[PDB]
Design a binder for this molecule. Structure first.
Ligand SMILES: CCCCCCCCCCCCCCCCCC(=O)O[C@@H](COC(=O)CCCCCCCCCCCCCCC)COP(=O)(O)OCCN
Lengths: 139, 102, 34, 88
């Protein structure tokens, strides 16, 4: 639902802000790059000044703000990506995280606790607070 | 010989109590995709940007891979879907990959 | 009595060493996973 | 004034962002949850869908934006909480 995708994008950003983390991949970020048409010049939608703004916010991958209407859960070309990232009953979402340097160094292993902490502090104070956070992988 | 019995009776690298093994089993179970830790990455690289013949061969490849139920438990396409396609492709477009859970 | 515990000082020292080691080992066995 | 309440909400969020902290409580956040109808779609205001954005930004308790117009300092339902949090 549109409400819990704001928290999903918040978690994705909070993980992407960890140090040696590059290329986080979520449903609100299906290729490590944010979804176009979701930043602030599109929540506001004469136009030739409000179109250049939206195009400057789409050319920069700016995703400080974010909204995805409830019109995307019935969009038939969105379900094949919605099944990859959310559980078949929607109760669990997953993020696919990549490192910068060597995942199996001494730093790529010290980043695991930091990923868990970032994802935990992202849901603090949100309706997803208290959810279980599982981090599998190879590091 | 000792090596035959050692190869027959191989044991996991990580314990069942390892939080990462717990997490990986739970992630695989919740998403209905297997109960293992193994996963290979079929990379396909082209000397020139991957085109439509590349996508046709890749579709055939994932079809042949999914059909084997005995060893291939799942695979995340991410390239056969235009919404996520650029998430499985290099910046220059000469390489793509797909993760297969074993 | 001290006269008889110094003919069996080796098994007593072995018991105390094995006990300390076993307690430390069963304590350290719990750290992983937790 | 509505100008300094932005800095107050900024301090509240910056304290909430500390690792071991839960439930910061301030005037712009009088119950550890951000004030409703102050988020980013409520400083913006085809309409029934915008009322959906309004409830999606409040069902997540989002707080990346906050205005709280300057004519709430005269609302009688505000003074009893404004006296608890700001000096007389
Ligand atoms: C990695 C594990 C290490 C743990 C263990 C560390 C070492 C611990 C050392 C503790 C010493 C306790 C042993 C006491 C030996 C007492 C000797 C005794 O009772 O009999 C002798 C009596 O001689 C004496 O007069 C000794 C009297 C002094 C005993 C006082 C104990 C001193 C404790 C030393 C403290 C060091 C502790 C260090 C702890 C880290 C002679 O008897 P025997 O010839 O008939 O026996 C031989 C045939 N089986």
């Amino acid at each position: 639902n549109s409400a819990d995708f704001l928290v999903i994008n918040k978690i994705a950003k909070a993980i992407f802000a960890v140090e040696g983390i590059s290329r986080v991949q979520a449903i609100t970020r299906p290729d490590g790059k944010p979804i176009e048409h979701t930043s602030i010049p599109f929540l506001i939608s004469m136009q030739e000044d409000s179109a250049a703004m939206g195009e400057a916010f789409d050319a920069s991958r700016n995703d400080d703000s974010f909204y995805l209407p409830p019109e995307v859960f019935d969009n038939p070309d969105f379900q094949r990506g919605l099944e990859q990232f959310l559980s078949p009953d929607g109760h669990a979402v997953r993020f696919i995280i990549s490192h910068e340097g060597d995942p199996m160094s001494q730093a790529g292993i010290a980043r695991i606790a930091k990923i868990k902490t970032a994802a935990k502090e992202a849901i603090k104070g949100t309706p997803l607070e208290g959810s279980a956070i599982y981090l599998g992988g190879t590091a | 010989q000792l090596e035959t019995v050692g190869q027959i009776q191989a044991v996991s690298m990580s314990p069942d109590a390892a939080p990462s093994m717990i997490s990986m089993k739970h992630i695989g179970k919740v998403f209905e995709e297997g109960d293992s830790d193994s996963a290979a990455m079929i990379v396909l690289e082209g000397q020139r940007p991957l085109g439509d013949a590349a996508h046709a061969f890749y579709d055939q490849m994932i079809g042949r891979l999914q059909a084997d139920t005995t060893h291939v438990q799942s695979l995340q396409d991410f390239w056969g879907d235009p919404l996520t396609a650029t998430g499985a492709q290099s910046s220059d477009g000469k390489a793509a990959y797909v993760q297969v859970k074993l | 009595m001290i006269g008889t515990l110094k003919r069996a000082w080796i098994p007593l020292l072995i018991l105390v060493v094995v006990a300390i080691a076993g307690f430390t080992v069963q304590r350290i066995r719990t750290f992983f996973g937790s």
